[PDB]
């Protein structure tokens, strides 16, 4: 499969999440995603074909993971934007007030601004600390997807937020949305990963 930020993948033929970013670990290919999407060794599939397994994860506390892929996968430095693509150029962290977009299988590509950093989410499973908050809308299924600036600087992966009864926060005003992402920097250093760029 071609690995691009924002596309759907399923875990153990049950749950769905979105791909965050293609990365490598020495000769190993992989993608970063949300830790809540799977447990170590869970199997990831893309379009019904097995692509790899969860190699590590932390959730709750943090919300991060990486899936190591088979050699046959094609890593690309891109994030889906409709039928088009945003090129990944690096991981400079943007500051509060910067515009940012996110990509995932349920709401597609959405943009907004970063409104706060170091936010705690109280999920049923336990607290997740140190998340950054944006006001781009998102929905059930978008987890693990990419957060990126139009300039191509990767910010983190989709964690959670105030989903309404219709499964997203897209029908409430930007001012009332809390969409939270796990910072990419600590994920790359924690696992020794390098981002694929173009």
């Amino acid at each position: 499969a071609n690995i691009v930020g924002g596309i759907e993948y399923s875990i153990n033929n049950a749950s769905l999440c979105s791909v965050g970013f293609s990365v490598t670990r020495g000769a190993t290919k992989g993608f970063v995603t949300a830790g809540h999407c799977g447990t170590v060794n869970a199997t990831a599939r893309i379009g019904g074909a097995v692509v790899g397994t969860f190699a590590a994860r932390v959730f709750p506390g943090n919300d991060r993971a990486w899936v190591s892929l088979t050699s046959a996968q094609t890593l690309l430095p891109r994030v889906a934007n409709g039928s088009s693509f945003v090129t990944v150029r690096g991981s400079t962290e943007a500051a509060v007030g910067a515009a940012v977009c996110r990509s995932g299988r349920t709401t597609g590509y959405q943009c907004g601004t970063i409104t706060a950093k170091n936010v705690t989410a109280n999920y049923a499973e336990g607290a997740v600390r140190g998340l950054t908050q944006g006001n781009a809308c998102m929905g059930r299924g978008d987890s693990g997807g990419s957060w990126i600036t139009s300039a191509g600087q990767a910010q983190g992966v989709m964690s959670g937020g105030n989903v309404q009864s219709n499964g997203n926060n897209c029908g409430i005003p930007a001012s009332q949305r809390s969409s939270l992402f796990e910072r990419l920097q600590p994920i790359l250093s924690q696992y020794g990963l390098s981002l694929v760029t173009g």
């Binding site: 109280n122 999920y123 937020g161």
Partner: peptide, 4 residues
């Protein structure tokens, strides 16, 4: 808040 909920994960996703």
């Amino acid at each position: 808040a909920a994960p996703v």
